[PDB]
């Protein structure tokens, strides 16, 4: 009766997104927060209209053939209204209100922990109505800090768990694929059924 | 009668102005025509009463508002017809849009028409999905009762105010949506008649306004 | 005492039919039924009733009233109605959502057979009682589609009558 | 069942024979046959009952009469039919007659089938009018019950002893009329019955006979 | 400051809606430019406040009015200025026509921007007569202030309800008057501002609305 | 199973033709356990 509880239903790491790193040849890379990146842990939130947790964020950066060699790399939250990064040498690395985390290849990965930040009391993702811009959640940077450009391309992966995470209003569980990453698109044609078919109403396949 | 509280709690104050007089009155919407070959209706609440007297007029002129409301949905048929309708609120319905397209620019978004249809509703065009994408076999998770030909004629529904700030507008934001449906459709012999009423009356239970912009 | 109000009082009509309002099952909705005045001393519906008769003989009369209605139709046959009252110095309402701002009762077939609006208060530029198809009038097969409503209207204890004349039907 | 006492009094007795025996049972008329174009009925109370039975007997042969009644009027339609019945008593039912002469030894006047019909009753000619000149629209001045086909079937009324003078002949002088009238018409659809009856029962409560005249 | 009460009664309540919110706030009307050739200015309260917010969209959409006033007539000049006001309410102010006609069907008579001017105001004509053919000289017996540019720059007046009915139109009828009449003109020394603001806020107090015709 | 036992009498003027609504849940003894991700996705 303890795995069917809505904080055991959701607290658990488990892949969040992938980011790309070049430094040849853009030197950066952003990541925007949204936990509706994959249609895995998006069909979970879209059970319950309200939310409200936190959250802890596992970046583990491997190379493109897989050696960890001893760099130095700059993780960067920006909280929400705050400017991203437009360069990889540009003074929004340098602001002290944009917390950073220094840690190389070959420590173990780095590990967060960002609370709710929200204006409202809760986070929903269901908005009806017009203006949901208003759970932006930050971004995350992430650059190697070097005074040269190195030539190596990395790759993040970040890692996402909820903790204390409370749950309201639920709603049913949504069937038909999905179309669009914001929008609950659905297609009027080739509507499929919750059921699979079978021969007849008097058997029991 | 039967009286379905929504979630379990009762409408009550901000722990603003109250009308307290003319607001908490029976606004009885016009009467939808259900058919044989009919899908279903919904209406958006905060934005159903915006046109309609007391409470439109204290409703557009402010610029915050919280209330709950009372649902009371007649059925009126004859001893020989036949048929079930589901009448469900849903927390923020948001319409979704019908297409194939994947491009979020050329993707296809319903129109205002649609979305806030007004103090006439708005007919469904898929209702075995909602028009969400989500299944009616299960919307029984809401606040909901059936309105079965052969037991009863009628339903209420007290719901309170379902949002994550206390206060909101009430025109840049629908709050919930009330959603007949005709599961099992509707029989009947020849000569009976061939459409039958469907009555909604509404009552704005604990109404607060504030922010008097005129 | 509760009098029928001859609301049909148009041309075209026989001697007791104008004593019922029709209401039908092709006859679409949200859309008006039936309009009438409210003041009894006046030429009109109120003419044909007991109070508007005694108040011909008195110049001054104030109070409240009382309008009754009746569903004259068969069992199976359920629908709503929205009576309507809208106070004077106001216009007939043209749209069933304008008239649900004023006074109003939705009053169904099912539950209940006969509703009653009570007038506030008028006096000696009167208010408009109106009545608006709703829902619909839905029916089940081997019943008839088409039934009628018996209006009454009466006076109550806040009613008062006072400088007499001598009236004008003789 | 819902009873309506005429004039808030009950009927009693004289401040005489008292038969109690056979005279305080209950009389059936013949039913009447209400269809889609009838008018309506009047019945004479003292001169409808002088030909059936102990009270005929009883009172053709005396020369003083005092009693009040105890009517029943049933009305069994199916649950399709639809309509409207008015039952009224009317003291002194004076019938009017139809003409338009002013003369008074021209001008027409109602015959004795007319005015006392007997045990068979009679129909209206001009039911607007009462037959009277007088309009049913303000008849419910008198003591009277809806017979509604979609409410009830049955009207009930105790009538007292009306009449400036405490005894007179049951035989010259009807004392009050009971009037059935269908404001709103018969409607049925097709394959049900054209007609539906109408029954009436009589109670002779609290009668006094005088003058034993053979 | 010194306080004048109408008639030495407060304005009370009936023995109807009360706002009591947003209708008790001092409207403040656009300042008037009095100069030295200045006659006087005239406003009908009732319809003064009519097409300005709160007050005037709940009374002009009832029916039922009764109010008090509290006026407040400020008058800022420099000490170097020399006049003096009078300023007074008169009860049932009528405007009268200026003309030699006896025949009624062609005697002038005042305009509806005459007699009831709005939220601007209106001059005076003949203000030796008051616009009425009565002489102000024996307007003192009104409620009444004098403004005197050397002793003070403010006046007060606190007025009940003056009516024969205790409920009355808000649209059709004007209750009563306000009046300012420069009886001693302004003079000044040349440099000096040649025309000095008077301003004029409103408080209804004790408002009480009827009849929500909409 | 669901088995039509006597007939479905029906009086004139009325429809030969109805349905019937199945609906499921669990109870106060239904437990759950050892989780795993879904494949309807």
Redesign the interface.
Known sequence: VLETTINHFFSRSGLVGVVNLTDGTTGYATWDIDIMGFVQLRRKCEMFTYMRFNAEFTFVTTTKNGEARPYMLQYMYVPPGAPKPTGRDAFQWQTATNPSVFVKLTDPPAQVSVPFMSPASAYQWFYDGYPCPNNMMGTFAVRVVSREASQLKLQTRVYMKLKHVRAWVPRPIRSQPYLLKNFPNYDSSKITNSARDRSSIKQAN | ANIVLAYGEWPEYCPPTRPDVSVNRFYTLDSKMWQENSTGWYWKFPDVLNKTGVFGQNAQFHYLYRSGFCLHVQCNASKFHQGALLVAVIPEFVIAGRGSNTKPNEAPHPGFTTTFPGTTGATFHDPYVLDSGVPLSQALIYPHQWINLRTNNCATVIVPYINAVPFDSAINHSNFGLIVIPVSPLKYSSGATTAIPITITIAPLNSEFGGLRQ | ??????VNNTTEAT??TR??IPVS?QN????LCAAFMVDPGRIGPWQ???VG?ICRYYTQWSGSLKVTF???????????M?VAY?????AQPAN???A???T???W????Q?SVSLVIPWISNTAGVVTL?????????????????I?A?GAAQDNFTLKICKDTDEV
């Open positions: 005492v509760e009098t029928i109000l001859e001697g007791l004593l019922l099952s679409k909705a949200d859309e044909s009733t007991l008769q009746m569903f004259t139709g068969s069992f199976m046959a359920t629908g709503k929205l809208s106070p004077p110095g106001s069933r959502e304008t649900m701002l004023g109003h009762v939705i169904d077939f099912g539950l057979s608006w198809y709703q829902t619909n009038y839905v029916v089940p097969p081997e019943t008839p589609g088409e039934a009628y018996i009454m």
